[PDB]
Design a protein around this motif. Structure first.
Motif, short mmCIF file in Angstrom:
data_model
loop_
_atom_site.label_atom_id
_atom_site.label_comp_id
_atom_site.label_asym_id
_atom_site.label_seq_id
_atom_site.Cartn_x
_atom_site.Cartn_y
_atom_site.Cartn_z
N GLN A 42 6.06 -14.15 -10.36
CA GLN A 42 7.51 -14.06 -9.92
C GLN A 42 7.96 -12.87 -10.24
OE1 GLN A 42 10.21 -16.65 -12.11
NE2 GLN A 42 9.32 -18.54 -11.41
N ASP A 43 6.96 -11.75 -9.98
CA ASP A 43 7.58 -10.40 -9.82
C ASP A 43 6.58 -9.75 -8.81
OD1 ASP A 43 9.24 -8.24 -10.79
OD2 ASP A 43 7.36 -7.51 -10.84
N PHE A 44 6.22 -10.67 -7.72
CA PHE A 44 5.24 -10.08 -6.60
C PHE A 44 5.63 -10.70 -5.32
CE2 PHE A 44 2.95 -10.19 -10.72
CZ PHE A 44 2.53 -8.72 -10.62
N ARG A 45 5.26 -10.08 -4.38
CA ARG A 45 5.24 -10.30 -2.94
C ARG A 45 3.83 -11.11 -2.49
NH1 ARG A 45 11.03 -9.42 -1.91
NH2 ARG A 45 11.45 -7.37 -1.79
N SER A 99 12.61 -18.89 -9.18
CA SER A 99 12.74 -18.31 -10.53
C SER A 99 12.65 -19.19 -11.58
CB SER A 99 14.35 -18.14 -10.28
OG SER A 99 15.12 -19.04 -11.11
N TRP A 123 11.25 -13.28 4.33
CA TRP A 123 11.74 -11.87 4.05
C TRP A 123 12.66 -11.73 5.24
CZ3 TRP A 123 11.37 -7.00 5.97
CH2 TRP A 123 12.20 -5.76 5.26
N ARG A 150 4.19 -5.22 -5.73
CA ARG A 150 5.05 -5.53 -6.65
C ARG A 150 6.63 -5.06 -6.28
NH1 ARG A 150 4.71 -4.34 -13.25
NH2 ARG A 150 6.60 -5.43 -13.57
N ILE A 151 7.35 -5.87 -6.36
CA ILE A 151 8.84 -5.87 -6.20
C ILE A 151 9.69 -5.02 -6.95
CG2 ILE A 151 10.95 -7.17 -5.61
CD1 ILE A 151 9.30 -9.63 -5.72
N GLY A 152 9.80 -3.68 -6.68
CA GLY A 152 10.40 -2.53 -7.30
C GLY A 152 9.90 -1.29 -7.25
N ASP A 153 8.44 -1.13 -6.84
CA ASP A 153 7.92 -0.14 -6.64
C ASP A 153 7.71 0.21 -5.06
OD1 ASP A 153 5.37 1.70 -6.08
OD2 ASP A 153 5.51 2.00 -8.43
#
Length: 71
Positions: free
Chosen positions: A38-41, A1, A20, A66-69
């Motif tokens: 910092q917003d991707f796998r 982070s 994971w 992407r983490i969220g979609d």
RNA sequence: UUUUUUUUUUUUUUUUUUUUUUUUUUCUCCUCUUUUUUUUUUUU
């Protein structure tokens, strides 16, 4: 982070990655883009487990979604 | 009623060459909790 990357320096060669599934240890890899992914796998691999380290070594492989979609 | 003389724009051209991306560091690092791990079956 972020608040723990701005302290890594800004050219932080070594980095630690969190898998994971709980079944896998953490992996020591060297990259130079940590402050803009910092917003991707992502995906990594493993080359050699070394005993002067508590962790196994790796290297980045390719980007993921992407983490969220849902994708 | 006022003669005669006081040069001018540096000379030169017919010389050989057998290399090659870059270049030179930064350390060890506590992943929290219902579990053994479920499992046939059929409609894609």
């Amino acid at each position: 982070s972020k608040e723990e990357v701005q302290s890594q320096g800004k050219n932080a060669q070594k980095i630690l990655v969190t898998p994971w599934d709980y079944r896998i240890p953490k992996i020591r890899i060297s990259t130079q883009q940590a402050e803009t992914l910092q917003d991707f796998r992502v995906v990594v691999r493993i080359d050699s487990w070394e005993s002067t380290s508590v962790y196994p070594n790796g290297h980045f492989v390719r980007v993921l979604g992407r983490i969220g979609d849902l994708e």
